[PDB]
Amino acid sequence: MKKIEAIVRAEKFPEVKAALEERGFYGMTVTDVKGRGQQGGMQIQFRGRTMEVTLLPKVKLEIVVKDDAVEEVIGLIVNSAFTGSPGDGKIFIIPVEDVVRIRTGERGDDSLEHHH
Amino acid sequence: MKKIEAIVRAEKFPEVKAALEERGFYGMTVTDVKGRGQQGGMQIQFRGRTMEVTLLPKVKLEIVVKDDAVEEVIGLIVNSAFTGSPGDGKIFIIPVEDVVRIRTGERGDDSL
Amino acid sequence: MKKIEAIVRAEKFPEVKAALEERGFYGMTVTDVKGRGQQGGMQIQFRGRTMEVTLLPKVKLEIVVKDDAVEEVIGLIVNSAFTGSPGDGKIFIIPVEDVVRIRTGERGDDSLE
Numbered sequence A: 001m002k003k004i005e006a007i008v009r010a011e012k013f014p015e016v017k018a019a020l021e022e023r024g025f026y027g028m029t030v031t032d033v034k035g036r037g038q039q040g041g042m043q044i045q046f047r048g049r050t051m052e053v054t055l056l057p058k059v060k061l062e063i064v065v066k067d068d069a070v071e072e073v074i075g076l077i078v079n080s081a082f083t084g085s086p087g088d089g090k091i092f093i094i095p096v097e098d099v100v101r102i103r104t105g106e107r108g109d110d111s112l113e114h115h116h
Numbered sequence B: 001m002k003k004i005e006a007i008v009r010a011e012k013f014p015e016v017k018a019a020l021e022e023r024g025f026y027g028m029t030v031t032d033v034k035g036r037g038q039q040g041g042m043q044i045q046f047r048g049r050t051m052e053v054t055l056l057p058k059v060k061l062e063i064v065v066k067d068d069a070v071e072e073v074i075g076l077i078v079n080s081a082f083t084g085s086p087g088d089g090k091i092f093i094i095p096v097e098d099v100v101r102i103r104t105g106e107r108g109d110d111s112l
Numbered sequence C: 001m002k003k004i005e006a007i008v009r010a011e012k013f014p015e016v017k018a019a020l021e022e023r024g025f026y027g028m029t030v031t032d033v034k035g036r037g038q039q040g041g042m043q044i045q046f047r048g049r050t051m052e053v054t055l056l057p058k059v060k061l062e063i064v065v066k067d068d069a070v071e072e073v074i075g076l077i078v079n080s081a082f083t084g085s086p087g088d089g090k091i092f093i094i095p096v097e098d099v100v101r102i103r104t105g106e107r108g109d110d111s112l113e
């Protein structure tokens, strides 16, 4: 199993959620966050004075899936979140050693849906 | 050491927090999040008016502990967060390679 | 590559952000969170009854960096977030198997920062 953690533009998140649901990926956890990237370098210019580069709102999506679904989900998120401009976001792939379903106590192979 | 990341109902979170504190598990970080699960499928019903399945509020708990404590913490969370209905949540066990205490610069299970 | 997840005081966060930027570490994701530590033990009081220990606001910083940069970034955070009182926070180092840049599809140390 892996955790896929994606940071995307708020404007694009509804198309990422729809793209995932259309292929049966329903379980997801979402957080409002702020971020910056390289754009702006060390500082910015506010008519006279020096200003820091602003942390701006973004949406964090976390989706935990079986190893055999990781590449499919990365593609769905990349093709729905893309616009072409700096600030489109990044995806991190993090190992998960086990998952427990609270309602049933199922774990391991029984804790996540099989797509294949 | 391991990071235990649990997504629970906001109504159950106080009972999970007390069950952990009773057994000396005091350090924890908590975030307000939203989520959906399998319940609802693709869309739901509001009158020949499809609507999307809503992302609803949940509480995310993160607690980092020694390897030997992981199963005890998982059972304390499951027993206090359970209701039996869809939406009860999930627990993810994630490896941590080290931990640093900012106040002293101490590392290892020591720093926990 | 590794994910460095640091929980720090809100008052110290602007000094942490400036210390990383000064050394060219620009990419970072920040979340408002709440937390408690050991301080307070099982409970407190009172006027004049017992109460739970309060989960209080903190700032979570996540920065993903190359393996060879981890010890430098740990030093930058410890020195800028330190005050010397209980509640200064903790840094967790979590393995990352890969990173994907959405704009280009590029992966690896390459996709950083």
Ligand SMILES: Nc1ncnc2c1ncn2[C@@H]1O[C@H](COP(=O)(O)OP(=O)(O)O)[C@@H](O)[C@H]1O
Residues within 6 Å of the ligand: A007, A034, A035, A036, A037, A038, A039, A058, A085, A086, A087, A088, A089, A090, C027, C028, C029, C030, C062, C063, C064, C065, C112, C113
């Ligand atoms: N190295 C990093 N670690 C953590 N979060 C990051 C990192 N890089 C980018 N992010 C997140 O992704 C968002 C978009 O960054 P990005 O698309 O890389 O912008 P830029 O093109 O300006 O570098 C950021 O605002 C931040 O939330």
Ligand SMILES: Nc1ncnc2c1ncn2[C@@H]1O[C@H](COP(=O)(O)OP(=O)(O)O)[C@@H](O)[C@H]1O
Residues within 6 Å of the ligand: A027, A028, A029, A030, A062, A063, A064, A065, A103, B007, B034, B035, B036, B037, B038, B039, B058, B085, B086, B087, B088, B089, B090
């Ligand atoms: N695979 C997943 N990845 C990330 N978060 C998830 C996953 N599955 C469930 N969750 C989180 O757990 C919450 C409860 O889901 P769950 O109990 O699985 O509901 P259901 O019974 O409807 O499938 C969700 O709203 C979401 O926040």
Ligand SMILES: Nc1ncnc2c1ncn2[C@@H]1O[C@H](COP(=O)(O)OP(=O)(O)O)[C@@H](O)[C@H]1O
Residues within 6 Å of the ligand: B027, B028, B029, B030, B062, B063, B064, B065, B112, C007, C034, C035, C036, C037, C038, C039, C058, C085, C086, C087, C088, C089, C090
């Ligand atoms: N084991 C842990 N797991 C998760 N988060 C923690 C842990 N320990 C501390 N934290 C986070 O770090 C913050 C600061 O804790 P810390 O400095 O250790 O306090 P104390 O000195 O009272 O033990 C907490 O409020 C919490 O957000």
Ligand SMILES: [Cl-]
Residues within 6 Å of the ligand: A094, B094, C094
């Ligand atoms: Cl993580």
Ligand SMILES: [Mg+2]
Residues within 6 Å of the ligand: A037, A038, A087, C027, C112, C113
């Ligand atoms: Mg970037």
Ligand SMILES: [Mg+2]
Residues within 6 Å of the ligand: A027, B037, B038
């Ligand atoms: Mg589910």
Ligand SMILES: [Mg+2]
Residues within 6 Å of the ligand: B027, C037, C038
């Ligand atoms: Mg502590």
